[PDB]
Amino acid sequence: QNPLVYLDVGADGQPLGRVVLELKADVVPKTAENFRALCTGEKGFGYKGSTFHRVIPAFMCQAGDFTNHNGTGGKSIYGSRFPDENFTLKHVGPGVLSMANAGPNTNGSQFFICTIKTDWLDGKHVVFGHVIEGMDVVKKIESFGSKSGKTSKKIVITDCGQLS
């Protein structure tokens, strides 16, 4: 079964709610497993207490940097970086869960949740899931973003884990 994970997000210490995500382990097992383990924190590290450092309205909300909290860091459960599994899944619309990177085969822990069809990213970024529930919470995160990416409020992942 494809894992069902959660992100509990807060803005300036005030809760925004829960984002439930389905991880397509049936298409991208290695990419899904990396994100699932970072939600539980079973490897001794992960998303708990980390932030959405770059948020651009009408585009995406970016997070995953649990090491430096500014886009310069983060690491995978396999090592520093891991290869691009495949580009089978496309950035078809809002709610798409995809890996941020620094070029080909540089996947770590940084990901993004789309707020629009980001089809110009197809073949460059690994899509590994989608929002099941809490798109209203994603839109709340989006409202705290700006054209530069700078957030108007500290967007923190207060809790995260696996539902099934």
């Binding site: 310069t72 995809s98 990177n101």
Partner: peptide, 11 residues
């Protein structure tokens, strides 16, 4: 521009 990168953020 509209990218999602980790290290050298581009326009």
């Amino acid at each position: 521009x509209l990218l999602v990168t980790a290290x050298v953020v581009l326009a």
